[PDB]
Amino acid sequence: DLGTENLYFQSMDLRVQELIKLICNVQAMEEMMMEMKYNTKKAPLGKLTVAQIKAGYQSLKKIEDCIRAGQHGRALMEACNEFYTRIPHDFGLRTPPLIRTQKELSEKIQLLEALGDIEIAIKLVKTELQSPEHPLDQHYRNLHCALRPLDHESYEFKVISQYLQSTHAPTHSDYTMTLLDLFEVEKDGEKEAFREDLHNRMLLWHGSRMSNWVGILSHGLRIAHPEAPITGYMFGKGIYFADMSSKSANYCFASRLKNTGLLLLSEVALGQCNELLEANPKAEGLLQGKHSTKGLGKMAPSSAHFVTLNGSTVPLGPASDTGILNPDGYTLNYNEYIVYNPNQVRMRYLLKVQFNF
Ligand SMILES: O=C(c1cc(Cc2n[nH]c(=O)c3ccccc23)ccc1F)N1CCN(C(=O)C2CC2)CC1
């Protein structure tokens, strides 16, 4: 009876144990990378180094350069086939495909960010064979990030549940989400680094792949690699947030097969927003004193329904029309918020979500 054993040994809380086991699962990372077409046979994850990953970003940048110069053939070939040599893919018998659009570049970046976090993960979960500490306690300490499970009958749980449900977007109707459990997050250093002074502090969503949480929790949400192609970033190399739960939960890349994902809530010090109506990867240089970028959506939660939780505005839904319509092109469906310094972020809650397909 695991409840009794836990109580006599006074071991880590069982809910934390299950969370740690889930995010530190190396087999799950192997499966995820195989689904991303990375060749785990030819370049095992255990032998991945950060120099290897950086050389990938570098080849990706050369690919970006080719696309930018309208060059296809020799310079590109030298570029694309060279990326693939550095970051082995498994295309079976098929011609390895060219990388030629923004979105193909984006997919490769997501692959390299994931690899980066797995490289962190595999190091983090190294245990001392002879230590008297349970392996999970060793992993948890190495995160340098407190995770405390919350009472489901609490007010904190009720509001986060309403946030989750009420801001599930109408266009993301392929699944619903069931909140399985909720943890408070306290990452070492974040409270003292945080820009408390800035106005417009909101509690906002961030979704990521299951492979990435060990990285995110141990190192924080980070500014993208300097050598990553800028075109991979709709509003530049910042930290991206949604006020709609499902816009962020789409970035969990959950599926019917792997229906358990995590969502992060963080306090985000937006300060004054520079509001933009469409994509600009150079958005960071447009701030000119302002503190964040707001990519303006067609539908957003409205202020009439906001609530505040320990000093951060929680933008409860439902979402309604914003009167915003780019005349120049394709407007966003929902908002996104970007900050360009980790000191504008304080992680606060981690939700374990079941996706109902
Ligand atoms: O926030 C993003 C990010 C996410 C996305 C996709 C995304 N992912 N997840 C979301 O919840 C989200 C919300 C609104 C808009 C986009 C998203 C796109 C570009 C980005 F720079 N980061 C890039 C990846 N991150 C990292 O720590 C890796 C190491 C650099 C965290 C910060």
Swiss-Prot record:
UniProt key word DNA-binding: yes
Residues involved in NAD(+) binding: 206-208, 215, 222, 248
Highest taxon in the source lineage: Eukaryota
Keyword Nucleotide-binding: no
Post-translational modification: Auto poly-ADP-ribosylated on serine residues, leading to dissociation of the PARP2-HPF1 complex from chromatin. Poly-ADP-ribosylated by PARP1. Acetylation reduces DNA binding and enzymatic activity.
Stated consequence of mutating residue 116 to A: Does not affect DNA-induced ADP-ribosyltransferase activity
Active site annotation, chain numbering: 336
GO molecular function: chromatin binding; damaged DNA binding; NAD DNA ADP-ribosyltransferase activity; NAD+ poly-ADP-ribosyltransferase activity; NAD+-protein mono-ADP-ribosyltransferase activity; NAD+-protein-aspartate ADP-ribosyltransferase activity; NAD+-protein-glutamate ADP-ribosyltransferase activity; NAD+-protein-serine ADP-ribosyltransferase activity
Domain PARP alpha-helical: 13-126
Enzyme class, broadest EC rank: transferase
Record's keyword terms, sorted: Acetylation, ADP-ribosylation, Allosteric enzyme, Chromosome, DNA damage, DNA repair, DNA-binding, Glycosyltransferase, NAD, Nucleotidyltransferase, Nucleus, Phosphoprotein, Transferase
Signal peptide: none
Transmembrane stretches, start-end: none
UniProt-annotated location(s): Nucleus; Chromosome
Enzyme Commission code(s) on record: 2.4.2.30, 2.4.2.-
Known tissue expression: Widely expressed, mainly in actively dividing tissues. The highest levels are in the brain, heart, pancreas, skeletal muscle and testis; also detected in kidney, liver, lung, placenta, ovary and spleen; levels are low in leukocytes, colon, small intestine, prostate and thymus.
Ranges for domain PARP catalytic: 134-357
GO biological process: base-excision repair; decidualization; DNA ADP-ribosylation; DNA damage response; DNA repair; DNA repair-dependent chromatin remodeling; double-strand break repair; extrinsic apoptotic signaling pathway
Catalysed reaction, written as an equation: NAD(+) + (ADP-D-ribosyl)n-acceptor = nicotinamide + (ADP-D-ribosyl)n+1-acceptor + H(+); L-seryl-[protein] + NAD(+) = O-(ADP-D-ribosyl)-L-seryl-[protein] + nicotinamide + H(+); L-aspartyl-[protein] + NAD(+) = 4-O-(ADP-D-ribosyl)-L-aspartyl-[protein] + nicotinamide; L-glutamyl-[protein] + NAD(+) = 5-O-(ADP-D-ribosyl)-L-glutamyl-[protein] + nicotinamide
Domain remark from Swiss-Prot or TrEMBL: The N-terminal region (NTR) recognizes and binds poly-ADP-ribose chains produced by PARP1, leading to its recruitment to DNA damage sites. The N-terminal disordered region does not act as a key DNA-binding domain. The WGR and PARP catalytic domains function together to recruit PARP2 to sites of DNA breaks. The N-terminal disordered region is only required for activation on specific types of DNA damage.
Quaternary structure and partners: Component of a base excision repair (BER) complex, containing at least XRCC1, PARP1, POLB and LRIG3. Homo- and heterodimer with PARP1. Interacts (via the PARP catalytic domain) with HPF1. Interacts with core nucleosomes.
Family the entry assigns: Belongs to the ARTD/PARP family.
Name the UniProt record assigns to this protein: Poly [ADP-ribose] polymerase 2
